[PDB]
Amino acid sequence: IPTYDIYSRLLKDRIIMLGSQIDDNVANSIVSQLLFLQAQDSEKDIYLYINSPGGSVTAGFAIYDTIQHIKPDVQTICIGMAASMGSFLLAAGAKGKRFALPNAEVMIHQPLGGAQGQATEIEIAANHILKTREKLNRILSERTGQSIEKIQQDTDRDNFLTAAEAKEYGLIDEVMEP
Amino acid sequence: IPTVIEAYDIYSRLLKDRIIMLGSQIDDNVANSIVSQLLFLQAQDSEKDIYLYINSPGGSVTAGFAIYDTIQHIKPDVQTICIGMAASMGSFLLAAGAKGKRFALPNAEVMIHQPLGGAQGQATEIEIAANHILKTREKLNRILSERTGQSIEKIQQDTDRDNFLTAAEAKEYGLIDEVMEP
Amino acid sequence: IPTVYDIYSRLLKDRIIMLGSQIDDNVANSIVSQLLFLQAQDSEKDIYLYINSPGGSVTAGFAIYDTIQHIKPDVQTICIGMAASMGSFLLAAGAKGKRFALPNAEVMIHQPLGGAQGQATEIEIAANHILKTREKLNRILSERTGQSIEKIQQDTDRDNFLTAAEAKEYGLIDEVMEP
Amino acid sequence: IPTVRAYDIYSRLLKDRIIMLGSQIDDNVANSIVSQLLFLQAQDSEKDIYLYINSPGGSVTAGFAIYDTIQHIKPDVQTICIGMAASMGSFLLAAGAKGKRFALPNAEVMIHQPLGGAQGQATEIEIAANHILKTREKLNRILSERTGQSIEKIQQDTDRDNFLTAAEAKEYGLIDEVMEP
Amino acid sequence: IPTVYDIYSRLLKDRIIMLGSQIDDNVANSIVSQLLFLQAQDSEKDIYLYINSPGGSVTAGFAIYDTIQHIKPDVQTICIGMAASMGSFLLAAGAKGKRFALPNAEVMIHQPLGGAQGQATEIEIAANHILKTREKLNRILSERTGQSIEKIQQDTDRDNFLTAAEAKEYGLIDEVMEP
Amino acid sequence: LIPTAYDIYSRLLKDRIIMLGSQIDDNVANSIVSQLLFLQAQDSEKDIYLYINSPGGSVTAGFAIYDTIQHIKPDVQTICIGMAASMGSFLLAAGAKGKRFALPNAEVMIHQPLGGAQGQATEIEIAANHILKTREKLNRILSERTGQSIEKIQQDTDRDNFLTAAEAKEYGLIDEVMEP
Amino acid sequence: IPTVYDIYSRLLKDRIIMLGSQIDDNVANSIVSQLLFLQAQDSEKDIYLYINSPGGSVTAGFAIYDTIQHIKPDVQTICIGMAASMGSFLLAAGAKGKRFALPNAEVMIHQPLGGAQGQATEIEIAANHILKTREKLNRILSERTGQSIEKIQQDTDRDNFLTAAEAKEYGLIDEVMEP
Amino acid sequence: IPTVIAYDIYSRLLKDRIIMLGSQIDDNVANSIVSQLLFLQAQDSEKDIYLYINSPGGSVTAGFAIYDTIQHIKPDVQTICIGMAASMGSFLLAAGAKGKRFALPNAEVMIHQPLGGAQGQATEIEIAANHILKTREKLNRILSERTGQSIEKIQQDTDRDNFLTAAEAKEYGLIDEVMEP
Amino acid sequence: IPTVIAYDIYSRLLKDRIIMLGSQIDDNVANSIVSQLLFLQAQDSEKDIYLYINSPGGSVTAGFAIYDTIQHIKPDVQTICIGMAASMGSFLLAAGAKGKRFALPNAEVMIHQPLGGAQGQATEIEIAANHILKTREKLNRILSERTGQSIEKIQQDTDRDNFLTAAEAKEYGLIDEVMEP
Amino acid sequence: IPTVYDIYSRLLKDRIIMLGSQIDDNVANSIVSQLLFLQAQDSEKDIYLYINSPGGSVTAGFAIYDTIQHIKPDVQTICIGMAASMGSFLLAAGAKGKRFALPNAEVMIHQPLGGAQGQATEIEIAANHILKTREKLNRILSERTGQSIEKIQQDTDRDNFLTAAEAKEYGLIDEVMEP
Amino acid sequence: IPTVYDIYSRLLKDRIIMLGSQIDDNVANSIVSQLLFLQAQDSEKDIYLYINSPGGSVTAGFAIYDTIQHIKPDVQTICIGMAASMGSFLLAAGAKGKRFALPNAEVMIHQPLGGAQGQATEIEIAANHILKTREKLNRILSERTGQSIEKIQQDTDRDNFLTAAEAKEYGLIDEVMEP
């Protein structure tokens, strides 16, 4: 990472690069970048590049809620792949400012997790992850215009979409052309 | 494991006298052996009692139900005798012996608790697993209710956490019929 | 972690502390030092503590908790992502009226976890100590939420997940911070 | 394990109603010892049985499977300590028929409180602590009955590892006689 | 570890030292050097030692202990979170009248731990050494707490957890620091 | 199993010969005790022969063998081949008086007991007192069986002390070097 | 390790060298370089070597030992916590009259440790070498304490723990440093 | 390991007074070999015994248990090297009855000094060194007696690994004859 | 490994003077093969023995224990390669009685120079190098005698892995006949 | 593995050999010995070789194959479950007209697998060898199925799964054994 | 490693290079670079190479050796602690009359170590190469000590430990550096 690295130079121009799995460390850093950019200028757009296989749903919601909280628009730009929570964040960008490059891929599926121990503990974990899926699907419905029933069906298995398909689905607004 | 010459290992020698020893965790291999022994004893004599000693921390619920159903399926009464400890599916099998012929020795310990499991993967896979283990707990509790005389609701409450019982407490609960005194 | 100052050090300049990890003695040492430094800079201005944490060490969390209550500035707490176990205890520890969660943040409360090994009398000592620790946590959660101790005991017996709105109803936070 | 029809040496001794407890006690060992006790009773409910004990102890519940079977069966079970009887091993030594509990002169006996573990939620640690304390009370009460010592004395004497010579074990009431050459 | 100086170096500028880890030779070397440095800068002004520690090496602790007693400034000790074993020994070693704990901080005292392996005579040497080390710890604790050596022996036979208020009654601290 | 299943050791046991050729642990001690009891049951008057090639091992396991030897009626000859070290040399010295042997190039080693202790100071104290008492017990018996003073045994066992067969006879650990 | 310079660098400005670890080649390299640097800055002013060390490599220790005797400044030695094995050898190596221990610091002396593997003639070479090294260590210790080599041999056969007062009586240090 | 009707192949050969050493020498192997030698003398104290040796060597004390038993018993023990006899294996080859030590033509013999290890305090390393040096003196003295070579030549010739052909072992005096087809 | 009534299958073949070498060659395998050869000679010193070989080779010294025993005993030993005979395996294949060395048509033969290792001081590496070089000369000389190929040719043909069909092994002189159906 | 013999031994009495595992030298040695024994018992009666095998060593497979072709009795081959790689080669090697599969048995053919490591010239030798081995396998498969060598080469470039009916149609077996 | 520059950089300013580790390609690269830099700064003034090293790679040692001989400044060598194997070779390589050891430093000489695995011919190549390397080392050692090659061969057959005074008498150094 070349140098005050290349990411800090892009941050000076209100660009945040997500290029990894989403965990609490990544979310803490991105949230802090978003807050800092709003403090610098509450009006100018922010640009969030997303190449991510997804990761923690709660870490992803830290980023998601910060995006919706701050005053500047956050443009989202998918490069390479936005899968799982990554495609949720892609769809979370400012309306009209969600993009994917022509060969970028988008994948949606249901959340993953685990449960171990007593029957009642497994029941609690199952209820929690099912409620988490409902929350994701409700928001994806609002952000895409698709019905919750259709999102439920379309995420039962791994669902790969081209950029053109992601646009038609309502996950992005435009395929960014050269 | 000593040998007895009339050449039997000690467990085979006791099987000759219609005694089956359960002294390990319950898995499919152990259940396969126990079931085969029960079927063999029935084939030998369908009237004489069988004696099942139980010192077991429990284990696989489905393997325990292979044993449970075989006990109920065969014609001879299967006396159960707890020595040391009968916990989880082990206490379930202890309570499954022929009515009036379920025993524990005075310092044997009985422990009841809800079944354990796990689930990994997609939310809908976790839901299927949760629904399955919950249905399995209902099945266990319903049978325990029948065999002890306790209501299902009391069993649910009394198995939420590990519940250790003395032999005397096990008799009062209905899990055994008598403490076998010296 | 980009440079502007690394990003966290830049936010600290504006009296913002980020808790975004498991709570251990190292994290608590750092958070406590930041709180003391900010009080030294200005004893009157608010401090903002963002919390995204699965929890962790009870004693480390109480190092942070007691420092929050000790210092003069109000400490606002803001849950983003998840505040679980000791993290949710710290969320509820913010200045009354200044405890927040964002709309999709999750809150989870549950009894403390631990272990005990050795002689019977050593297991007894360890059990008494963790039981006392839970009573201590529940007493404070009762005063900070308005709920009875009996209700907190019962509601923490197993993992209990709360939405942001449920956390407000419960008294763990004061407001869901809307966009 | 040499052979002596063919017997291993332990099977040969079992023909003379001798059982050798020469290892840590777990469920596998207890299962074998119990089966040997039941077999010998089935062969002859009158004749004494001889239980040699060289054991560091082990599982308390497995030890009680052995303990209760000894008390259940009709024959007297003599106990003979060689080398070491520690923890649950010393509990079983004291469990022999009264008047027929022995140690050889240099055998070592050790008594101490039970050991265990617990992990997880506070309430789970509470349940495990209550269970091991009740197990200790059960062990101390029986040891009081078999030794003549008060439960309060047994409690104080098992708080830490307590090593006894054979002659001290006799004075304590854990055995009846030191078998002198 | 945020930057302002890193946060700990910034606190050191105000004569605050943070012990927030297990005690070992490296930690003691750092703490001793900070104490000698602070005395060199000003031999009259108080030093503040925050303690959140599970304890650790007895000899490393005594490097710290003897340096506190050696230097001219008073060293205040402030327990946050937990001071256990050699950590609670150092808490009680602060200047008399200037030993503190925050209300929910926990203090634990117990006898030293160690090991030995090899020949009978090697084990005997190691046993005699740790027993003498325990006598030394107990004698000093007795002096610093006002409790008899026999009571300290009894009270440290097993893990002994104390609240901050109990630590004050015991004589391990002078006051519970209230908000 | 080595050659015939009825192995070579079982064939030697028919002739009242017990072959110790390993470290001494509870399994080995239980086997040897059982063999000794068996041989006494077969004939309480005929000698037993115990060959010893052992680096030593568990002190309590060794005392199970030692006390059984003293308990039974038959004389137990001891014959050192290769090495009898630590508790192996203790058992070598415990054979019937006048019937303790070593072959000419066999080696004997004596030293103090080994052990460990971990935990609280008072737990280490208990463990140290126990191993010190075990050493006094070993030295007292070795004094009785060799004729050497307890103080000399203490000195001579402070460190590993290797002895030739002839030196072990001079020391009193054996009665005769068995020459061809 | 806080910044002021790191804390050790800051103490080095005042001619203080902190030994707070095992002695190996890397540690010896650093301490020798610090000694040479301090001589080059001022050949007259005393140097201060603090020692909390469990010992370590004999040859690395002699790199430090010989450099102390080589340079012109006096090197005071101050034991804090523990000086064991080669650590106690270095403590005894300070300028005569300027060897100190703090009151609860401990000192341990014993013979060197090592290993040998391979052919009989290789084990013989290794045995002769460690025996000659012990003779070298005991001879120098005899000169530095005033004790006979026979007494030092007897007193290092096994681990031999000494209090600070005992180390003064032994001649390993000159004074116990009281507060 | 095949069976001959029931003997395993080695037990079948032992019936004909043949003992096969085909492994490293440790206490277990020595226990077996010593027991076989004692057994064969008990059957017949006059007829020769045949010890085939293919061994890389191993424990010196285990080798001396075998060595001393060979010299103790009345029957002659012929030794026959096949494959390799190295270190303590070549010591045992040379220990066979005079005139009855053999190697097949392509068997190898290797002699060298004993190997060992030592850890701990200087005085413990000294004790370990003195013991292995004394052991080497014992081995060389006996090899001198059995080969006819001086002790000083044995010392020189075993300082490093020294490989000999069958014919060279005969000229050296380690064996009496190369057994030709 | 199935049983025939009671023989395991290998023991049943041994009854018919058939030895199966079906694994890597080490001291344990050579100990068993040698014992079987000696046993069969004792049963009948005139009747042929049949040694099947499916082996990747292995220890050169273990292989020479088998080799020399084959040449020492009176019966002819026929050798029959099935599957593969590589390295010391192909050396033993060529060691069969002249005219009675066979391979089945799809069996594979591979010859190559010996493998080993050396570690330590320069003079120790030199000793190990000299020894493995002398071993290679020994192997090459015997292979020259048994195949009719010059030593120079065997040297160059074994510098690297050299794979031979059964037909090529016959032309090379490693076997006498390809055993056709 | 039950008794009555073990179950495989009881079937061998009836001239049935079960191959139900990977083909390695141990398996091949046993199967070759079983074939030779059965020929010695009766040189005229058929032998039955059941095959459920994922393949294995090519040379081990050829020990079996050559022994099948060498002995006088016919060897029927019967595929149950799966015959893959060297397993399908042995299936095709049965006596002509006496090679079978059960209706849901699967057959798989592909090219041999191997590895090579070292100098360029060593890699070249290993490549030439495995390429020659494939030519041998294909030539025999061509003879035993009636397919051209070119077709066999094409059809084994990748894993090629075949139903029992496709295997019969291919020439690898003669009949699908129907219930 | 304290700051002043780390301590080694501070000494390099005064033309001092410290070797205090095993010799590998990484250490040799750094030392060679320092030697070349120092010559470029000043081709006339002496360079001082301190050596405490157990040795290591022969080729890496020759990288240093040849660079010492190549550059114009005299390189003094000073053994502290131990110089063994290639370390003692480099000690003996210093400028004539400027090779030193401190009084208790030890010097060890022995033959090179290595290994070889694979075909007979590969083992032969490796043996020939290490024997040649030993001849190369012994030839240069003979030139630099004045001892004959045959004596060096004898004296390096096994590990040979020398005191500083013995190393001077041998010709490996010129002077024992006294205080």
Numbering used by the authors:
A (entry chain L): 4 to 6, 18 to 192
B (entry chain B): 4 to 9, 17 to 192
C (entry chain M), E (entry chain N), G (entry chain H), J (entry chain G), K (entry chain I): 4 to 7, 18 to 192
D (entry chain C): 4 to 7, 16 to 192
F (entry chain D): 3 to 6, 17 to 192
H (entry chain E), I (entry chain F): 4 to 8, 17 to 192
Reported in the publication:
The caseinolytic protease P (ClpP) subunit is a compartmentalized structure with two stacked heptameric rings that form a central chamber containing 14 identical catalytic sites sequestered by two protective axial pores. In any case, even the degradation of small oligopeptides depends on some structural factors, and the most important one is the orientation and positioning of the catalytic triads formed by Ser98, His123, and Asp17224.
Aiming to explore and explain this paradoxical effect, we solved and refined the crystal structure of native ClpP from Staphylococcus epidermidis (Se), an opportunistic pathogen involved in nosocomial infections, as well as ClpP in complex with ixazomib at 1.90 Å and 2.33 Å resolution, respectively. The crystal structures of native SeClpP and SeClpP-ixazomib complex were refined to 1.90 Å and 2.33 Å, respectively. The superimposition of both tetradecameric structures displays that the complex is slightly more extended than the apo SeClpP, and the Cα RMSD is 1.63 Å for 1451 atoms. In both cases, the monomers are composed of a common structure consisting of the following main parts: E-helix with a Gly-rich region, catalytic site, head domain, oligomerization sensor, and N-terminal loop. Despite the similarity between the overall structures and the high homology between amino acid sequences of ClpPs from different species, a closer look into the monomers exhibits a difference in the Gly-rich region. Figure 2c shows that the apo SeClpP has a more disordered Gly-rich region with an unstructured loop and two small antiparallel beta-strands formed by two subunits from opposing heptameric rings. A comparative analysis with the native SeClpP, the SeClpP-ixazomib complex, and SaClpP Y63A29 structures revealed that the Asn42 side chain in the complex, as well as in the mutant, is shifted to the “down” position (the hydroxyl group is approx. 5 Å distant from Tyr21). In the native protein, the residue is found in the “up” position, as expected.
